[PDB]
Amino acid sequence: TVIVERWWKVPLAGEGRKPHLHRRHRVYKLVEDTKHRPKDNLELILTQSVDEIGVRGDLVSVKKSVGRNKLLSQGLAVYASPENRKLFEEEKSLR
Amino acid sequence: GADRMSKWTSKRGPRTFTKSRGAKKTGIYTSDRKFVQIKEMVPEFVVPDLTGFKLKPYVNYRAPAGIDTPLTAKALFQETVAPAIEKDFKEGTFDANNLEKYGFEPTQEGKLFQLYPKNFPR
């Protein structure tokens, strides 16, 4: 997402009121474009055996592209939500 | 230089412009460019026999006019329908289902003269 910032100051409006804007308050400068940020990883718990990643019940940190396109869409994995973690850990312990 | 205010009629304009003066259609045009009149579409005047009729256009000045009382739905119901229901109710032979016995019509379909939507002229 593109994030912008005013060049010109906007005077304070008050507590319940809204500022009145002028045509000079429509000039912006770009502070950041989020698409260029370093990428993160996605946490998932495997539900079925898969090559080179794991077998079952093991949390895996994967690239967002792979996790959203292959594992979750095909049903091989589930979100590492607190509830999903709790169910899988109990099954592992009993096993 | 044209006149914007006068009415647009078929006497005006070129040959190919034509329109009606409000007379109702009495037939159909087919292909082959032939007009075919329909008999049922031509209005028929129902004229009564006036022999031996006592009423004339004017009335005598000595005839007393009456207090005006426009007819209402309540008045019609009491004069026509109320007496029959009252007698039957006393006898006990009355039910809501058989209102048609007293002249009620559930729907106007099938009638030649439908009261809504009206399907006949004056």
Partner: protein, 88 residues
């Protein structure tokens, strides 16, 4: 009229409805007789019973114009009474 009320309860012989025209006004529309249902009639479908947003400005201008006429009328009546009371 009385007989129609008893049998159908309708106050008018001809069907109609309240609709908004393309100029932003509310008008009574009288129906016509047709051999086919409305959704198959291409000449009828070209007729529009709605107003687009550019009409909102004119709706306000009509309301204000009507307001000026009423104010002048009431003002004139009050002034005329002053003359009558003075005379009599």
């Amino acid at each position: 009229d009385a007989l129609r009320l008893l049998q159908t309860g309708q106050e008018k012989p001809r069907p109609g409805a309240w609709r908004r025209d393309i100029f932003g006004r509310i008008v009574w529309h009288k129906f016509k007789q047709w051999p086919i249902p409305w959704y198959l009639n291409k000449r009828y479908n070209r007729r529009r019973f709605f107003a687009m947003p550019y009409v909102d400005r004119f709706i306000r201008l009509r309301i204000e114009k009507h307001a000026r006429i009423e104010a002048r009328k009431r003002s004139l009546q009050k002034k005329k009474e002053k003359i009558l009371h003075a005379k009599f």
